[PDB]
């Protein structure tokens, strides 16, 4: 009997405008009447939670509590509380969560490194590393997207933010995508995106084909007409 | 002191001019024009589609440009590309360049 | 319209500097034209205007001309000297043309490009 | 380990380069970092290493990543910056790489200029 409480990402409000609250919890004994209540910070409960979990396969069993709320209000920043009342221990586990309040805004500084020319010659794979940096409040979501199709995410593994050694405040993470050399080598520029609440328009992209990323070469062919 | 002729932003040339008035000669001045150009080699040819080839030739026809398809990202006014993102998918929008793109 | 600057040679006797201001190839006559000179308009005297005299190549078209004198000493302030055409099949019936010393053709260029990553910004 | 140099981006910026080392899909767990210049080591702060990360493309072969930030007023200097990395399947338990900034250094020019009046 372990819960997650899991806060909707900001990206996920702002592409879905829907902002879902949930908490589970994992590998609990699923007996049925297991009941959660979503209540406030006033105790006053709000909507309910239905498509609710079931029994897993492995034994680590588990429990979707699904939520609403207004945006604003947690903009405005009230602690949330869904609470386990199942007879495994009838004892009323609280589950508070809220927003932060104070953080700053900071934005990303999306740079993207190309793949080492060493692992260029082990022949097979290839490795690029979208980059985000010196930016608050943490949570910043990515996906990688190239040739205007999508890349589903078992492809790239993306870390999570962790404070910089120099900055006080500002996170970062990372983001790595692993593609045969050939396809690299076939040109086949890749794009990765990020969106983050300090973002303008809230979301900026960089990309890197072979030739932007490290050449070795510069061929520069222009002319001048007309002085 | 210097005369700008031309001051392209989003080619980065910019022609001057400047008289140099000679040594207190009389009028065997010659008039002098200064040109200058910041090349990127770090762009696309579809300035605003990053999913193009880099770029090779630089064409300047001064002509042209003494008076639309020119390669630098102008810093004041600023570009976007409508990108899909997928969580369901959605074809949404972006900013392709950070601090100019900012609704203030 | 256009506007030629004087002769180099012109500029070695010392004093005649003179103008030229021009038209091509246009249909019809009755065209006027006049010279500024910082939005004040020049002495009628000061130059000398021509007649439409009809082109040689041209089926019917017209040209003329007017031509115009003063200190070549003054060739050193400039300013330019606007040559006002006046004729009424322009959009606004004036298609004014100017030309001054920095005007012109230089013989001293120095052509400066540079080379960088660090661009695709024009600042 | 394939040790990456910093974004011409950020050297752009001419801000604090970081330089990120890249341990790859390998087995078990437990993999260790530090960095090393000049063969004396920096202090564990100068840098931050995730725990290992499985892999998704391969089986539970894992990867991680530790990344050194410097001032690149310093990277521009030389500097080697060599990141060590010790995991027991290692055929002798420690490798190294390094890279500095002749690393990615382009090597040739190809300018055309055809300057004219035509
Ligand atoms: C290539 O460039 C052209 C113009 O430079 C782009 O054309 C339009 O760009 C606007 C930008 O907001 C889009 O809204 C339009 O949909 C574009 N029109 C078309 C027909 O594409 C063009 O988008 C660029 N190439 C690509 C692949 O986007």
Not at chain 1, 4 to 29: E, G, Q, Y
Not at chain 3, 17 to 28: R, W
Not at chain 3, 51 to 60: C, L, W
Request: aromatic share 8%.
């Amino acid at each position: 009997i372990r819960v997650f409480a899991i806060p909707p990402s900001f990206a996920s409000i702002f592409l879905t405008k829907s902002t879902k609250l949930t908490c589970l919890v994992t590998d609990l004994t699923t007996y049925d009447s297991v009941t959660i209540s979503w209540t406030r910070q006033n105790g006053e409960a709000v909507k309910t939670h239905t498509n609710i979990s079931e029994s897993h396969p492995n034994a680590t069993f588990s429990a979707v509590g699904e939520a609403s709320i207004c945006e604003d209000d947690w903009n405005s920043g009230e602690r949330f509380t869904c609470t386990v009342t199942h007879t495994d221990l009838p004892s009323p586990l609280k589950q508070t969560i809220s927003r932060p309040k104070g953080v700053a805004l900071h934005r990303p500084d999306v740079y993207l490194l190309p793949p080492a020319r060493e692992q260029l010659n082990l022949r097979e794979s290839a490795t690029i590393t979208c980059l985000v940096t010196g930016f608050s409040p943490a949570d910043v979501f990515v996906q990688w997207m190239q040739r205007g199709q999508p890349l589903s995410p078992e492809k790239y593994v993306t870390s999570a933010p962790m404070p910089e050694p120099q900055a006080p405040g500002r996170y970062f993470a990372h983001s790595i995508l692993t593609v045969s050399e050939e396809e690299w080598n076939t040109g086949e520029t890749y794009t990765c995106v990020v969106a983050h609440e300090a973002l303008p328009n809230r979301v900026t992209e960089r990309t890197v084909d072979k030739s932007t990323g490290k050449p070795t070469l510069y061929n520069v062919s222009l002319v001048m007409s007309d002085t | 002191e210097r005369i700008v002729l031309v001051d392209n932003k989003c080619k980065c040339a910019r022609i001057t001019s400047r008289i140099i008035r000679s040594s207190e000669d009389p009028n065997e001045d010659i008039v002098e024009r200064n040109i200058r150009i910041i090349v990127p080699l770090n762009n696309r040819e579809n300035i605003s589609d990053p999913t193009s080839p880099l770029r090779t030739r630089f064409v300047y026809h001064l002509s042209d440009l003494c008076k639309e398809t020119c390669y630098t990202y102008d810093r004041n006014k600023c570009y976007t590309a409508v990108v899909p993102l997928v969580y369901g998918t959605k074809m949404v929008e972006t900013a392709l360049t950070p601090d100019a793109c900012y609704p203030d | 319209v256009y506007l030629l600057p004087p002769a180099r040679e012109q500029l070695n006797l010392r004093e005649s500097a003179t103008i030229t201001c021009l038209v091509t190839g246009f249909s019809p006559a009755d065209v006027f034209v006049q010279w500024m000179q910082r939005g004040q308009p020049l002495s009628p005297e000061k130059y000398v205007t021509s007649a439409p005299m009809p082109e040689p190549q041209a089926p019917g078209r017209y040209f003329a001309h007017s031509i115009l004198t003063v200190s070549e000493e003054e060739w050193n302030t400039g300013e330019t000297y606007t040559c006002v055409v006046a004729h009424e099949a322009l959009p606004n019936r004036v298609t004014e043309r100017t030309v001054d010393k920095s005007t012109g053709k230089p013989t001293l260029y120095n052509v400066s490009l540079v080379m960088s990553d660090t661009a695709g910004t024009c600042y």
